[PDB]
Amino acid sequence: ELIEQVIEQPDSLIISPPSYNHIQPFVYLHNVLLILNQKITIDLISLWKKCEIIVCADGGANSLYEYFNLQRSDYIPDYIVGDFDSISPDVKTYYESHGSKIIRQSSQYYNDFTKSIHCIQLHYQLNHTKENWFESIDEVDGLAKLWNGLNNSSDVVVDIDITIYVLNAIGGRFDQTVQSINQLYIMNEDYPKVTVFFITTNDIIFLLKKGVNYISYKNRLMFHKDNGSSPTPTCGLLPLSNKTPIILNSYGLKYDMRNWKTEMLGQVSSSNRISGETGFIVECSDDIVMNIEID
Amino acid sequence: SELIEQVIEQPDSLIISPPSYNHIQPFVYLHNVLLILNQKITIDLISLWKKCEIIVCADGGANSLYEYFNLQRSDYIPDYIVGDFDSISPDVKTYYESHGSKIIRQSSQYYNDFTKSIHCIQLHYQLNHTKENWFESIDEVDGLAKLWNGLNNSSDVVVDIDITIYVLNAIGGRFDQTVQSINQLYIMNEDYPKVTVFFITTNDIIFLLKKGVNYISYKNRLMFHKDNGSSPTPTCGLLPLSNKTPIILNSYGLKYDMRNWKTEMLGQVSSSNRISGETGFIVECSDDIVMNIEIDV
Ligand SMILES: Cc1ncc(C[n+]2csc(CCOP(=O)(O)NP(=O)(O)O)c2C)c(N)n1
Ligand SMILES: Cc1ncc(C[n+]2csc(CCOP(=O)(O)NP(=O)(O)O)c2C)c(N)n1
Ligand SMILES: [Cl-]
Ligand SMILES: [Cl-]
Ligand SMILES: [Mg+2]
Ligand SMILES: [Mg+2]
Ligand SMILES: [Mg+2]
Ligand SMILES: [Mg+2]
Ligand SMILES: [Mg+2]
Ligand SMILES: [Mg+2]
């Protein structure tokens, strides 16, 4: 079998575009903003303005509220969903009194993240026709059932491009972090036209799709404040799925890989860097998570 | 198999009697080693420190330790400070260097500060009792990695020594670092089963459940779960993050107990589970699997 190679490249390279997946993770610097329960440390307003719909997952509402501790009243989430065991009474009242669509789901088998995603998927299927499509659903798992029902009735338009920016889904309770990644892989397998970006305090996390991927951006300066001790943005390729091992070929990373097999309990490329000034290429034998540091 | 994958909703409180099995006592802290990575320290550092024999700072982790005192900072000097040193600040570096910390610089581009620190820890328990300056004059690029390797090829390794390593700031920061840490957790257990690793974060404690039966015990849940009222049970999760999938689970004592429940990424993963066992619980797994338990002391 081919030699697993790692090529140390110069700090800067120009990679020409490659039949392939084109990812533009930094365009933000059908858009949906999903807010989970963690203190918001990014330029919320800037992202918000680029999104068509904003959804708060239970406690995410508190996070949005507290962000204003700008007029808090100018940023009302379209939907607030979950079992509501974290959202605070005052916050809940506040947004309810401002028109946020409340979807309480008491199911102990789906978390607020999943319930919110279902709400988002159902929104792009039923909202344009019925603004209050959510009001009469089952209180336990109506979102789960309804999304399942629509597919059973063939009433689902599988042809709609959605980009979901998720805040506060990574970095908190570890099981929540892993569940989010799990759903990232699952959603791509089930709904390939939905692109998910987890934007955290330290980086942006997305999925590289089986095959050739071309990640582009104007330049690295848009997401990596000019260094001097850091001529390159940090990144990683994380094989967190049940498909192992994954073969990687990269062009444009500081430590470029050629037929390099990656898997947990094996070698994992972390602390890699981006040398491509305008983009880089990653070919993978199966879906794999990639994180790029932002600062 | 063909067995039904069951999930049993248990009452908020249960008493599970002890089960050969792996006994895990994650909260005894509420051969101990403290490994400090680069992130603001939010835990009760001094209490943990006082329970540890050796303390190691992975590069930037020294800054984290330093800033914690912004108690006398001078009373807590780390035994070792290792890594490529591209994050530790000159000031902090000089500060601890002037206080006796053993400095081990490693410029290798193929191992991170975490791994270099672990190697230093493993090497310490092998060579330090012999010579306090065993680390000096080692290769500047990957001497630790080489030494650990050469030491094994020389059969000079004391394979029988129980070590418990408490790691701070390895989870929750840059995601690739989080993943690499978990990767190492699995690798270390495969290669060094006598070393027990506990990742203590701002939100939880993360450790490995070992293939077979595991009995997790503690005085009571009040030890790590500040009395509830609207939260009668501590939160936990079982995360199949290895290359061995799927993993079959059987639990006794969790709010949502599993029986012959198959878990894997791209499939079902038990998250937001809770702990019903008042003094402990049991998890049997077909292969090693990560478990996190939320902490709020
Ligand atoms: C095998 C298994 N493991 C765990 C669970 C628990 N569970 C899965 S998602 C669901 C709700 C999670 O609620 P949230 O999204 O508010 N997260 P939380 O704040 O309750 O920890 C629960 C309790 C379950 N139902 N089944
Ligand atoms: C296939 C592959 N991927 C990535 C790398 C890069 N790499 C692995 S660990 C090593 C050093 C990591 O340094 P640190 O522990 O200080 N973490 P950092 O602050 O540099 O991001 C590097 C640069 C590599 N050498 N090979
Ligand atoms: Cl550039
Ligand atoms: Cl208790
Ligand atoms: Mg909730
Ligand atoms: Mg809940
Ligand atoms: Mg929920
Ligand atoms: Mg370093
Ligand atoms: Mg470094
Ligand atoms: Mg290093």
Author numbering:
A (entry chain B): 6 to 23, 30 to 40, 50 to 89, 100 to 325
B (entry chain A): 5 to 23, 30 to 40, 50 to 89, 100 to 326
Copied sentences from the primary study:
This result is consistent with the earlier suggestion that the pyrophosphate group is transferred at once from the ATP molecule to the thiamine moiety. It is stabilized by a weak electrostatic interaction (3.28 Å) with the S301B γ-oxygen in the C. albicans TPK/TPNP complex. The first two ions superimpose exactly with the ones co-crystallised in the C. albicans TPK structure with thiamine. The last coordination of this Mg2+ involves an oxygen atom from the free inorganic phosphate symmetrically positioned with regard to the AMP phosphate shown in the mouse ATP binding site (Mg2+ number 3).
The production of thiamine pyrophosphate (TPP), catalyzed by TPK, is critical for both catabolic and anabolic cellular processes. In yeast, this thiamine phosphate is then hydrolyzed into thiamine before pyrophosphorylation by the TPK that catalyzes the transfer of a pyrophosphate (PPi) from ATP to thiamine, resulting in AMP and TPP. CA1462 is a homodimer, with each monomer constituted of two domains.
